[PDB]
From a paper:
ER export is mediated by the coat protein complex II (COPII), which minimally comprises five cytosolic proteins that form two concentric layers on the ER membrane—the inner and outer coat.
The vertex was refined to a resolution of ~12 Å. We could clearly distinguish the β-propeller shapes and unambiguously rigid-body fit the available Sec13/31 crystal structures. In the context of the membrane-assembled coat, we see a clear gap between both the ‘+’ and ‘−’ pairs of β-propellers.
Residue numbers in the entry: 2 to 157, 170 to 292
The structure:
Amino acid sequence: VVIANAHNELIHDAVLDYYGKRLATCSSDKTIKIFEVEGETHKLIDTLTGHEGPVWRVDWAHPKFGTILASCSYDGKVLIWKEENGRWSQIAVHAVHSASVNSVQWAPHEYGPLLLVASSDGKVSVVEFKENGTTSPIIIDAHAIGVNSASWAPATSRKFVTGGADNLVKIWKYNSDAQTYVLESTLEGHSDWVRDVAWSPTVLLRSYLASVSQDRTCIIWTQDNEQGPWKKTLLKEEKFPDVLWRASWSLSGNVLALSGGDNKVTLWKENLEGKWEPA
């Protein structure tokens, strides 16, 4: 199934929603597009407008809140969108960062309608939408140089991993006696900017993290339990041909989808040894 020419400017993100039927894209044209794919057909449904700069990413929210989509852009702001009564409209706007926002992600539906945001300004913001609408977020300084990604850990006590341009990967946990997310662990292992970080939703004892970097390597970080440390495990002994840009875990099977710069997508799974191989 292919939807050629969804945009005329280069596209940076395409995400299907909770039912994996409703597509959504974003690119330099500074717009988002909603699609409806079936067998091998497709129908545009709208074009979201507002961002003053190329749009970097989008994330669909859990259906239990409505039909929402979040986006962020080089313009250093985040826009939420809604499809009420049959038409999309900018409900809220989040802009507390002073540089390009590169990632945005809806927390687990159990936490409510929270949003995880990371920016080149080095900070990360956590945002909920009050009873009235406005937003009173959490802002933390999380990386030097710039933050490129941030992902939520599955639900139990709330944790999320960030990936900065300081080559570091970082786990965060919420604390009461601070009313903020505090730095739980710093994981060193990349020699160049970390482009993305994905926390696997696998519900097994062991937790899985996958970080991708400008150094042409993918690292799977794992933690057996609370007393265990985060163990480093290169996805493969040899570096890759080009820069790895994204990492995505399936919802089941704990299968990793790696997006390279040689515009190639490799798939991996774990084996008896604890080493990865092509799935």
